[PDB]
PDB file of all heavy atoms in Angstrom:
ATOM      1  N   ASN A   1     122.746 101.686 105.293  1.00  0.00           N
ATOM      2  CA  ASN A   1     122.983 100.212 105.535  1.00  0.00           C
ATOM      3  C   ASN A   1     121.552  99.741 106.127  1.00  0.00           C
ATOM      4  O   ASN A   1     120.960 100.461 106.758  1.00  0.00           O
ATOM      5  CB  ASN A   1     124.139  99.891 106.401  1.00  0.00           C
ATOM      6  CG  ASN A   1     124.241  98.459 106.788  1.00  0.00           C
ATOM      7  OD1 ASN A   1     124.506  97.574 105.876  1.00  0.00           O
ATOM      8  ND2 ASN A   1     123.980  98.054 108.030  1.00  0.00           N
ATOM      9  N   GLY A   2     121.301  98.493 105.844  1.00  0.00           N
ATOM     10  CA  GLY A   2     120.046  98.018 106.329  1.00  0.00           C
ATOM     11  C   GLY A   2     118.939  98.538 105.444  1.00  0.00           C
ATOM     12  O   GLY A   2     117.794  98.652 105.872  1.00  0.00           O
ATOM     13  N   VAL A   3     119.199  98.861 104.145  1.00  0.00           N
ATOM     14  CA  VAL A   3     118.250  99.495 103.219  1.00  0.00           C
ATOM     15  C   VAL A   3     117.328  98.430 102.800  1.00  0.00           C
ATOM     16  O   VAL A   3     117.668  97.280 102.404  1.00  0.00           O
ATOM     17  CB  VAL A   3     118.961 100.239 102.115  1.00  0.00           C
ATOM     18  CG1 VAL A   3     119.477  99.105 101.152  1.00  0.00           C
ATOM     19  CG2 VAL A   3     118.088 101.121 101.318  1.00  0.00           C
ATOM     20  N   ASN A   4     115.974  98.711 102.882  1.00  0.00           N
ATOM     21  CA  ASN A   4     114.926  97.883 102.205  1.00  0.00           C
ATOM     22  C   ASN A   4     114.989  98.222 100.761  1.00  0.00           C
ATOM     23  O   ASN A   4     115.389  99.206 100.284  1.00  0.00           O
ATOM     24  CB  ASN A   4     113.530  98.224 102.850  1.00  0.00           C
ATOM     25  CG  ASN A   4     113.303  97.440 104.084  1.00  0.00           C
ATOM     26  OD1 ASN A   4     114.026  96.481 104.379  1.00  0.00           O
ATOM     27  ND2 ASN A   4     112.260  97.804 104.846  1.00  0.00           N
ATOM     28  N   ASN A   5     114.671  97.091  99.983  1.00  0.00           N
ATOM     29  CA  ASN A   5     114.531  97.237  98.545  1.00  0.00           C
ATOM     30  C   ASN A   5     113.277  96.705  97.998  1.00  0.00           C
ATOM     31  O   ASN A   5     112.990  95.391  98.256  1.00  0.00           O
ATOM     32  CB  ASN A   5     115.823  96.404  97.964  1.00  0.00           C
ATOM     33  CG  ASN A   5     115.988  95.078  98.618  1.00  0.00           C
ATOM     34  OD1 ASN A   5     115.154  94.663  99.490  1.00  0.00           O
ATOM     35  ND2 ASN A   5     116.900  94.298  98.170  1.00  0.00           N
ATOM     36  N   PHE A   6     112.412  97.509  97.402  1.00  0.00           N
ATOM     37  CA  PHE A   6     111.159  97.213  96.885  1.00  0.00           C
ATOM     38  C   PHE A   6     111.301  96.869  95.359  1.00  0.00           C
ATOM     39  O   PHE A   6     111.939  97.764  94.720  1.00  0.00           O
ATOM     40  CB  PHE A   6     110.214  98.279  97.133  1.00  0.00           C
ATOM     41  CG  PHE A   6     109.570  98.381  98.540  1.00  0.00           C
ATOM     42  CD1 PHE A   6     110.550  98.305  99.608  1.00  0.00           C
ATOM     43  CD2 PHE A   6     108.209  98.449  98.743  1.00  0.00           C
ATOM     44  CE1 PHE A   6     109.917  98.410 100.912  1.00  0.00           C
ATOM     45  CE2 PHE A   6     107.766  98.440 100.020  1.00  0.00           C
ATOM     46  CZ  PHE A   6     108.618  98.478 101.115  1.00  0.00           C
ATOM     47  N   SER A   7     110.721  95.911  94.904  1.00  0.00           N
ATOM     48  CA  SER A   7     110.746  95.510  93.477  1.00  0.00           C
ATOM     49  C   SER A   7     109.321  95.595  92.986  1.00  0.00           C
ATOM     50  O   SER A   7     108.406  94.782  93.265  1.00  0.00           O
ATOM     51  CB  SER A   7     111.336  94.155  93.254  1.00  0.00           C
ATOM     52  OG  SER A   7     110.545  93.169  93.962  1.00  0.00           O
ATOM     53  N   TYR A   8     109.067  96.681  92.123  1.00  0.00           N
ATOM     54  CA  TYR A   8     107.699  96.855  91.618  1.00  0.00           C
ATOM     55  C   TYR A   8     107.642  96.521  90.103  1.00  0.00           C
ATOM     56  O   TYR A   8     108.651  96.933  89.360  1.00  0.00           O
ATOM     57  CB  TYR A   8     107.265  98.306  91.781  1.00  0.00           C
ATOM     58  CG  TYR A   8     105.892  98.491  91.072  1.00  0.00           C
ATOM     59  CD1 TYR A   8     104.734  97.959  91.562  1.00  0.00           C
ATOM     60  CD2 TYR A   8     105.779  99.200  89.834  1.00  0.00           C
ATOM     61  CE1 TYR A   8     103.556  98.076  90.960  1.00  0.00           C
ATOM     62  CE2 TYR A   8     104.644  99.283  89.267  1.00  0.00           C
ATOM     63  CZ  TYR A   8     103.465  98.790  89.782  1.00  0.00           C
ATOM     64  OH  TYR A   8     102.217  98.884  89.197  1.00  0.00           O
ATOM     65  N   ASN A   9     106.661  95.764  89.647  1.00  0.00           N
ATOM     66  CA  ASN A   9     106.540  95.368  88.329  1.00  0.00           C
ATOM     67  C   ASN A   9     105.107  95.769  87.729  1.00  0.00           C
ATOM     68  O   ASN A   9     104.180  95.023  88.063  1.00  0.00           O
ATOM     69  CB  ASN A   9     106.680  93.843  88.150  1.00  0.00           C
ATOM     70  CG  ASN A   9     106.787  93.424  86.663  1.00  0.00           C
ATOM     71  OD1 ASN A   9     106.171  93.849  85.818  1.00  0.00           O
ATOM     72  ND2 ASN A   9     107.768  92.477  86.445  1.00  0.00           N
ATOM     73  N   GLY A  10     105.088  96.973  87.230  1.00  0.00           N
ATOM     74  CA  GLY A  10     103.791  97.365  86.668  1.00  0.00           C
ATOM     75  C   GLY A  10     103.171  96.512  85.517  1.00  0.00           C
ATOM     76  O   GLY A  10     101.958  96.036  85.566  1.00  0.00           O
ATOM     77  N   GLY A  11     103.989  96.031  84.690  1.00  0.00           N
ATOM     78  CA  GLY A  11     103.655  95.188  83.528  1.00  0.00           C
ATOM     79  C   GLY A  11     104.744  94.573  82.948  1.00  0.00           C
ATOM     80  O   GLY A  11     105.993  95.044  82.978  1.00  0.00           O
ATOM     81  N   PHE A  12     104.547  93.370  82.286  1.00  0.00           N
ATOM     82  CA  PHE A  12     105.626  92.552  81.825  1.00  0.00           C
ATOM     83  C   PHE A  12     105.845  92.788  80.331  1.00  0.00           C
ATOM     84  O   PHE A  12     106.865  92.348  79.871  1.00  0.00           O
ATOM     85  CB  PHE A  12     105.304  91.062  81.958  1.00  0.00           C
ATOM     86  CG  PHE A  12     105.168  90.591  83.418  1.00  0.00           C
ATOM     87  CD1 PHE A  12     103.926  90.603  84.031  1.00  0.00           C
ATOM     88  CD2 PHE A  12     106.257  90.308  84.065  1.00  0.00           C
ATOM     89  CE1 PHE A  12     103.843  90.194  85.395  1.00  0.00           C
ATOM     90  CE2 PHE A  12     106.241  89.935  85.393  1.00  0.00           C
ATOM     91  CZ  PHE A  12     104.977  89.826  86.033  1.00  0.00           C
ATOM     92  N   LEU A  13     104.979  93.494  79.647  1.00  0.00           N
ATOM     93  CA  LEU A  13     105.171  93.781  78.168  1.00  0.00           C
ATOM     94  C   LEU A  13     106.475  94.645  78.012  1.00  0.00           C
ATOM     95  O   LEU A  13     106.899  95.307  78.946  1.00  0.00           O
ATOM     96  CB  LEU A  13     104.029  94.456  77.592  1.00  0.00           C
ATOM     97  CG  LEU A  13     102.610  93.908  77.813  1.00  0.00           C
ATOM     98  CD1 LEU A  13     101.579  94.947  77.420  1.00  0.00           C
ATOM     99  CD2 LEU A  13     102.476  92.614  77.052  1.00  0.00           C
ATOM    100  N   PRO A  14     107.096  94.647  76.828  1.00  0.00           N
ATOM    101  CA  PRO A  14     108.162  95.563  76.562  1.00  0.00           C
ATOM    102  C   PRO A  14     107.818  96.916  76.776  1.00  0.00           C
ATOM    103  O   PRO A  14     108.509  97.784  77.264  1.00  0.00           O
ATOM    104  CB  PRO A  14     108.597  95.164  75.091  1.00  0.00           C
ATOM    105  CG  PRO A  14     107.901  93.997  74.688  1.00  0.00           C
ATOM    106  CD  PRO A  14     106.746  93.858  75.583  1.00  0.00           C
ATOM    107  N   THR A  15     106.568  97.257  76.316  1.00  0.00           N
ATOM    108  CA  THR A  15     106.081  98.692  76.432  1.00  0.00           C
ATOM    109  C   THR A  15     105.879  99.015  77.950  1.00  0.00           C
ATOM    110  O   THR A  15     105.900 100.324  78.264  1.00  0.00           O
ATOM    111  CB  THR A  15     104.870  98.890  75.695  1.00  0.00           C
ATOM    112  OG1 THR A  15     104.455 100.219  75.745  1.00  0.00           O
ATOM    113  CG2 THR A  15     103.679  97.975  76.205  1.00  0.00           C
ATOM    114  N   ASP A  16     105.604  98.083  78.843  1.00  0.00           N
ATOM    115  CA  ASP A  16     105.259  98.347  80.127  1.00  0.00           C
ATOM    116  C   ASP A  16     106.397  99.076  80.857  1.00  0.00           C
ATOM    117  O   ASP A  16     107.616  98.896  80.577  1.00  0.00           O
ATOM    118  CB  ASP A  16     104.851  97.073  80.923  1.00  0.00           C
ATOM    119  CG  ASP A  16     103.611  96.420  80.366  1.00  0.00           C
ATOM    120  OD1 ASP A  16     102.735  97.239  79.819  1.00  0.00           O
ATOM    121  OD2 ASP A  16     103.417  95.195  80.409  1.00  0.00           O
ATOM    122  N   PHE A  17     106.019  99.815  81.928  1.00  0.00           N
ATOM    123  CA  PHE A  17     106.938 100.512  82.859  1.00  0.00           C
ATOM    124  C   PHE A  17     107.215  99.653  83.959  1.00  0.00           C
ATOM    125  O   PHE A  17     106.313  98.983  84.609  1.00  0.00           O
ATOM    126  CB  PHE A  17     106.278 101.907  83.176  1.00  0.00           C
ATOM    127  CG  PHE A  17     106.853 102.342  84.519  1.00  0.00           C
ATOM    128  CD1 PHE A  17     108.047 103.065  84.582  1.00  0.00           C
ATOM    129  CD2 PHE A  17     106.083 102.152  85.741  1.00  0.00           C
ATOM    130  CE1 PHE A  17     108.449 103.569  85.756  1.00  0.00           C
ATOM    131  CE2 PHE A  17     106.572 102.608  86.903  1.00  0.00           C
ATOM    132  CZ  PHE A  17     107.753 103.390  87.005  1.00  0.00           C
ATOM    133  N   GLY A  18     108.514  99.690  84.380  1.00  0.00           N
ATOM    134  CA  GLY A  18     108.974  98.775  85.455  1.00  0.00           C
ATOM    135  C   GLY A  18     110.171  99.311  86.188  1.00  0.00           C
ATOM    136  O   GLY A  18     110.949 100.016  85.550  1.00  0.00           O
ATOM    137  N   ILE A  19     110.265  99.044  87.464  1.00  0.00           N
ATOM    138  CA  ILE A  19     111.461  99.349  88.251  1.00  0.00           C
ATOM    139  C   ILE A  19     111.907  97.989  88.841  1.00  0.00           C
ATOM    140  O   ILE A  19     111.155  97.427  89.720  1.00  0.00           O
ATOM    141  CB  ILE A  19     111.226 100.274  89.362  1.00  0.00           C
ATOM    142  CG1 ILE A  19     110.801 101.745  88.752  1.00  0.00           C
ATOM    143  CG2 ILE A  19     112.414 100.499  90.241  1.00  0.00           C
ATOM    144  CD1 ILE A  19     110.178 102.779  89.562  1.00  0.00           C
ATOM    145  N   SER A  20     112.967  97.457  88.474  1.00  0.00           N
ATOM    146  CA  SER A  20     113.391  96.029  89.039  1.00  0.00           C
ATOM    147  C   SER A  20     113.688  96.227  90.478  1.00  0.00           C
ATOM    148  O   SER A  20     113.496  95.263  91.280  1.00  0.00           O
ATOM    149  CB  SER A  20     114.658  95.640  88.237  1.00  0.00           C
ATOM    150  OG  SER A  20     115.166  94.494  88.769  1.00  0.00           O
ATOM    151  N   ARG A  21     114.208  97.338  90.941  1.00  0.00           N
ATOM    152  CA  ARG A  21     114.496  97.512  92.415  1.00  0.00           C
ATOM    153  C   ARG A  21     114.781  98.995  92.791  1.00  0.00           C
ATOM    154  O   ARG A  21     115.604  99.587  92.162  1.00  0.00           O
ATOM    155  CB  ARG A  21     115.752  96.617  92.776  1.00  0.00           C
ATOM    156  CG  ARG A  21     115.839  96.523  94.270  1.00  0.00           C
ATOM    157  CD  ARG A  21     116.954  95.528  94.656  1.00  0.00           C
ATOM    158  NE  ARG A  21     118.284  96.223  94.729  1.00  0.00           N
ATOM    159  CZ  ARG A  21     119.241  96.165  93.997  1.00  0.00           C
ATOM    160  NH1 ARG A  21     119.248  95.457  92.882  1.00  0.00           N
ATOM    161  NH2 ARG A  21     120.381  96.909  94.144  1.00  0.00           N
ATOM    162  N   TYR A  22     113.969  99.460  93.674  1.00  0.00           N
ATOM    163  CA  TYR A  22     114.191 100.819  94.175  1.00  0.00           C
ATOM    164  C   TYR A  22     114.351 100.749  95.725  1.00  0.00           C
ATOM    165  O   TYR A  22     113.646 100.007  96.484  1.00  0.00           O
ATOM    166  CB  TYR A  22     112.988 101.766  93.895  1.00  0.00           C
ATOM    167  CG  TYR A  22     111.723 101.436  94.369  1.00  0.00           C
ATOM    168  CD1 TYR A  22     111.133 102.316  95.391  1.00  0.00           C
ATOM    169  CD2 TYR A  22     110.940 100.366  93.981  1.00  0.00           C
ATOM    170  CE1 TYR A  22     109.874 102.016  95.881  1.00  0.00           C
ATOM    171  CE2 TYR A  22     109.702 100.103  94.491  1.00  0.00           C
ATOM    172  CZ  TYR A  22     109.202 100.909  95.433  1.00  0.00           C
ATOM    173  OH  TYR A  22     107.833 100.724  95.920  1.00  0.00           O
ATOM    174  N   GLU A  23     115.482 101.445  96.229  1.00  0.00           N
ATOM    175  CA  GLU A  23     115.758 101.361  97.707  1.00  0.00           C
ATOM    176  C   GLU A  23     114.924 102.250  98.488  1.00  0.00           C
ATOM    177  O   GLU A  23     114.451 103.398  97.995  1.00  0.00           O
ATOM    178  CB  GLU A  23     117.274 101.660  97.877  1.00  0.00           C
ATOM    179  CG  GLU A  23     118.186 100.517  97.641  1.00  0.00           C
ATOM    180  CD  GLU A  23     119.685 100.890  97.856  1.00  0.00           C
ATOM    181  OE1 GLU A  23     119.927 102.130  98.006  1.00  0.00           O
ATOM    182  OE2 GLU A  23     120.537 100.012  98.008  1.00  0.00           O
ATOM    183  N   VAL A  24     114.672 102.009  99.728  1.00  0.00           N
ATOM    184  CA  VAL A  24     114.013 102.793 100.726  1.00  0.00           C
ATOM    185  C   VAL A  24     114.624 102.469 102.039  1.00  0.00           C
ATOM    186  O   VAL A  24     115.308 101.562 102.298  1.00  0.00           O
ATOM    187  CB  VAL A  24     112.456 102.503 100.700  1.00  0.00           C
ATOM    188  CG1 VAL A  24     111.825 102.670  99.353  1.00  0.00           C
ATOM    189  CG2 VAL A  24     112.208 101.034 101.229  1.00  0.00           C
TER     190      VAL A  24
END
């Protein structure tokens, strides 16, 4: 509880790799 959530967007293309939300 109280987990931080980081949203990283490497690239917007369909081919690009992305993580909409990862907890820390």
Side-chain angles (χ1 to χ4, degrees):
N1 175 69
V3 71
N4 273 346
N5 44 2
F6 281 50
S7 58
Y8 176 72
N9 188 322
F12 296 98
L13 311 166
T15 185
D16 293 332
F17 153 83
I19 295 164
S20 180
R21 193 175 90 252
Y22 64 112
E23 275 183 350
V24 304

